């Protein structure tokens, strides 16, 4: 029995929709600190981790800790039924039913049955990342959109005071370059020259849903996976892990 209040149901819907693109079912862990989630897609190529401490929530009330599982499609639809200025309320009783209510111009409550999902706890230890680049969401979104025009793979090339993402097809080529002096790049910290490539399908699936003005930091190495980060209202965070190519 908990009472969770969230202002701006649209942002919550966007976050859950972004999370649900890769996966189908997940279990939400709720404790006295916040809500955390983690899962891996059926293709074993992407791992998504999400947390939401109590600081962001307008009102939080939880006793103990429990894991709540539910289908992503139905939850996504119910959240999409929300508006821009409403306040989302997640509440539940002893009965194992998830009751979602949106309180704006009028109060509407939906019932979403629960589901049990096996939990496979896996943590990938932090690896030696030879580059850390912080860029806006718009630049990466547009770069991915262009790269998808010529080929189905994308390439990153980090260098001292230099970052550039490329893409090559059978005949055509695409290249995007930026520097620290530019306004699209904030900070770059490279230890040595780096080169890697990632599929355009997964990059497009995960990038879609980032505001034009946002902060995104990418950690990648030489022929090793990539990590993407960005904060949710300055307290929570979202973690993406993508396996490399070749």
């Amino acid at each position: 029995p908990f009472e969770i209040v969230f202002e701006g149901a649209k942002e919550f819907a966007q976050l859950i929709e972004t999370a649900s693109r890769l996966i189908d079912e997940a279990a939400f862990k709720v404790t006295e600190e916040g809500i955390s989630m983690r899962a891996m897609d059926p293709s074993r190529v992407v791992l998504i981790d999400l947390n939401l401490p109590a600081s962001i929530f307008s009102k939080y009330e939880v006793d103990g800790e429990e894991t709540i599982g539910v289908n992503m499609d139905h939850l996504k639809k119910v959240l999409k039924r929300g508006k821009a200025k409403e306040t989302l309320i997640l509440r539940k009783g002893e009965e194992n039913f998830l009751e979602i209510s949106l309180q704006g111009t009028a109060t509407r409550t939906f019932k979403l049955p629960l589901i049990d999902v096996e939990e496979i706890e896996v943590d990938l230890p932090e690896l030696p990342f030879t580059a850390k680049v912080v860029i806006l969401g718009d630049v990466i979104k547009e770069a991915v959109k262009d790269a998808s025009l010529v080929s189905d793979s994308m390439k990153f090339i980090a260098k001292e005071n230099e970052f550039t993402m490329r893409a090559e097809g059978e005949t055509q080529e695409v290249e995007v370059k930026l520097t620290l002096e530019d306004e699209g790049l904030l900070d770059i910290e490279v230890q040595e020259e780096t080169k890697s490539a990632y599929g355009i399908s997964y990059l497009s699936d995960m990038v879609k849903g980032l505001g034009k003005a946002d902060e995104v930091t990418i950690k990648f190495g030489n022929e090793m996976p990539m990590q993407m980060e960005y904060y949710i209202r300055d307290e929570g965070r979202l973690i993406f892990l993508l396996a490399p190519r070749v």
Partner: protein, 447 residues
């Protein structure tokens, strides 16, 4: 009832000392020596349908380009006109065209051929009185040929001559060897079948170790150096419906283990080259780079065993050997009336004359979608080996020997129903210096 030739041990006969001969060989071709490059898709989200079509089209283009170069080698061919620009030719010029044979039909006046090239298609006619009409009769589609004739604006290319890639009539003899050396050809062992005659194989293995009768046999065995196997070394798993009742060894792993144990008795002064076939654990369609390592490991673990591909070219003391299984013979026999499985040499000669190991597409042979053709016979060899028909044969065509090594499997129910008479336990013996079959063994008594 599941023995796997575990305790079959044959020891060298301590009465003959093998002649100290410097072994000299090199593998001049392997399928896993060329790095084929997949065809990049020309859009950012290309789906699987178009890539396969692109790969097949590229395969056939490469076949055409590779075979054309061979045709433009005999000086008698000249003035090749592109089919796409064939229209810009007067009615009093003589030109030649080269392209794939789309199809063929016979009429009283002659033959009607449809020829395609990288730029267009054209119809051709061959007068019945032409001296090359008989040769052009036994040509089956997808072969690359050249035609010389007069072009008419009426829409048909009337022709008088026809050319196959063929083999040159004259070649330079190689220098001789210091001493004689012999090689033994084997094929189609089919270990793991109820009809695999093992006693004959054991007698052959004993013969290889020096247990002979006459003096010439003893002298030869002291010189035998190389042994070559040409596929179908095991009976396979699930090849045809209802095969489980025909298998003494119904386990692919155990079939390979039994085969490996059997061949351990080959003398260590002899080297063995092994290639796959259509019943082994190897690629579904030709060309087959090699066996599947994780299934065929026991024979990889042999000390004097070299695993070759299908097809592969081997060089022994400067003589080029071409080794292939022989799945292409069936298409020739089906498409050329009058040829039978009981004289396989003539179909192999035909395949040599076409300079291709399996021309037809969509028939009795599977062809993998590779972006380059590896079945063409680029360089003319001094010996060609084949199998797959379980019948022995040997012929000579313009200085290159063609040998079909028989099987070690007795006639099965299918071969009774289809009326195929196998000739098991025949083992050709070839001289390396001349690359000719000098003697044929026969251990069929116990088979």
């Amino acid at each position: 009832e599941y023995s796997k030739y575990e305790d079959v041990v044959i020891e060298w006969n301590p009465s003959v000392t093998p002649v100290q001969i410097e072994k000299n060989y090199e593998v001049k071709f392997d399928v896993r020596q060329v790095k084929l490059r997949p065809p990049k898709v020309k859009n950012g989200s290309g789906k699987e349908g178009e890539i396969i079509v692109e790969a097949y089209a590229s395969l056939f283009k490469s076949r055409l380009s590779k075979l054309k170069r061979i045709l433009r080698e005999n000086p008698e061919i000249s003035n090749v006109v592109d089919i796409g620009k064939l229209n810009y030719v007067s009615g009093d010029e003589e030109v030649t065209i080269i392209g794939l044979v789309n199809s063929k039909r016979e009429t009283n006046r002659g033959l009607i051929f449809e020829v395609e090239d990288k730029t267009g298609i054209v119809k051709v006619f061959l007068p019945k009185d032409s001296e090359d009409y008989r040769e052009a009769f036994k040509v089956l589609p997808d072969a690359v040929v050249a035609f010389k004739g007069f072009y008419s604006k009426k829409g048909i290319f009337f022709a008088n001559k026809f050319y196959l890639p063929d083999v040159p009539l004259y070649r330079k003899q190689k220098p001789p060897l210091e001493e004689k050396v012999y090689a033994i050809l084997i094929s189609d062992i089919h270990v793991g079948s109820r009809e695999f005659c093992e006693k004959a194989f054991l007698k052959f293995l004993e013969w290889l170790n020096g247990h002979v009768e006459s003096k010439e046999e003893e002298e030869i065995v002291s010189r035998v150096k190389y042994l070559i196997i040409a596929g179908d070394v095991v009976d396979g798993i699930g090849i045809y419906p209802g095969q489980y009742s025909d298998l003494v060894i119904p386990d692919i792993f155990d079939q390979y283990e039994a085969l490996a144990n059997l061949l351990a008795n080959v003398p260590e002064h002899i080297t063995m080259f092994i290639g796959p076939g259509n019943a082994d654990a190897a690629r579904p369609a030709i060309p087959q780079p090699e066996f599947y390592k994780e299934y065929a490991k026991p024979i990889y673990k042999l000390k004097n065993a070299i695993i070759i591909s299908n097809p592969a070219v081997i060089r022994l003391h400067g003589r080029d050997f071409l080794i292939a299984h022989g799945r292409g013979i069936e298409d020739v026999v089906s498409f050329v009336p009058g040829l039978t499985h009981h004289k396989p040499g003539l179909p192999m000669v035909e395949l040599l004359k076409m300079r291709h190991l399996a021309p037809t597409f969509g028939g009795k042979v599977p062809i993998a979608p590779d972006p380059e053709d590896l079945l063409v016979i680029e360089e003319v060899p001094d010996l060609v080996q084949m199998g797959h028909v379980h019948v022995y044969d040997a012929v000579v065509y313009r200085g290159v020997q063609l040998v079909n090594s028989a099987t070690w499997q007795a006639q099965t129910e299918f071969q009774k129903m289809v009326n195929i008479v196998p000739t098991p336990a025949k083992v050709p013996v070839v001289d390396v210096e001349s690359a000719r079959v000098v003697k044929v063994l026969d251990f069929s008594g116990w088979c």
